[PDB]
């Protein structure tokens, strides 16, 4: 009996998208925080956005997650319109990641007393 199943190429590995660090994790500058294919979490304070929508930590610190108000860039039109048609009482919210800096910025050392 002809057993042809017409479907092809279901097979891909998973991309291991997801959250790499968790709230209250210590982080060094450069660590990737989470990696996603669509924006699930947006970059907050001290979190840089990679061209593939990676989130990495800019400072040395503690990673925090947050629900905050979303005010799209006036250059990006779709989001501008989505913001436009809302009923007059409602604001948009999203989830952000943050780094909270640990090390102080610097120190004043006494080099020489002349």
């Amino acid at each position: 009996t002809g057993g042809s199943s017409k479907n092809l190429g279901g097979k891909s590995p998973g991309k291991r998208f997801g959250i790499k660090k968790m709230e209250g994790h210590y982080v060094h500058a450069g660590n990737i925080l989470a990696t996603q294919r669509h924006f699930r979490w947006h970059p907050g304070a001290h979190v840089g956005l990679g061209k593939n929508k990676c989130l990495y930590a800019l400072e040395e610190g503690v990673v925090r997650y947050t629900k905050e108000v979303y005010v799209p860039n006036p250059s990006n039109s779709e989001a501008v319109d989505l913001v436009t048609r809302l009923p007059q009482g409602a604001v948009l919210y999203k989830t952000f990641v943050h780094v909270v800096p640990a090390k102080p910025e610097g120190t004043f050392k006494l080099v020489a007393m002349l």
Partner: protein
């Protein structure tokens, strides 16, 4: 040598700055603030202030924006902050009131476009 917050960037405006010039145009009054990333309002010039209120006519005028501009310039120098960032909107940047706000600011001696960070 301090920190800014390099970040956000799905949102607007860019929150990287020490001092952000903020200009709110109400249908009535022109208000200009200078803010710290902490949200604190450092130095402000508003029209509802009796000082600017009594000295001139028609609050919504381009003239009143020049005025609030150089009043905030004066007050800024007195506060010793010579550097702040301004992020107007694409449509806002073309209006006369704002061009004259920026000219009042420049003649005042106040430099926009904040100096870079050292070892960022």
């Amino acid at each position: 040598v301090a920190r800014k917050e390099r970040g956000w960037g799905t949102v607007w405006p860019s929150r990287e700055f020490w001092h952000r010039l903020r200009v709110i145009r109400t249908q009535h009054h022109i208000e200009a603030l200078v803010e710290h990333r902490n949200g604190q309002v450092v130095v402000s010039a508003s029209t509802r202030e009796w000082a600017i209120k009594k000295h001139l006519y028609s609050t919504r005028n381009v003239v009143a924006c020049e005025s609030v501009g150089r009043v905030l310039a004066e007050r800024c120098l007195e506060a010793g902050i010579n550097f702040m960032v301004y992020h107007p909107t694409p449509w806002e940047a073309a209006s006369d009131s704002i061009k004259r706000l920026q000219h009042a600011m420049t003649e005042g001696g106040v430099v926009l476009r904040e100096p870079r960070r050292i070892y960022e």
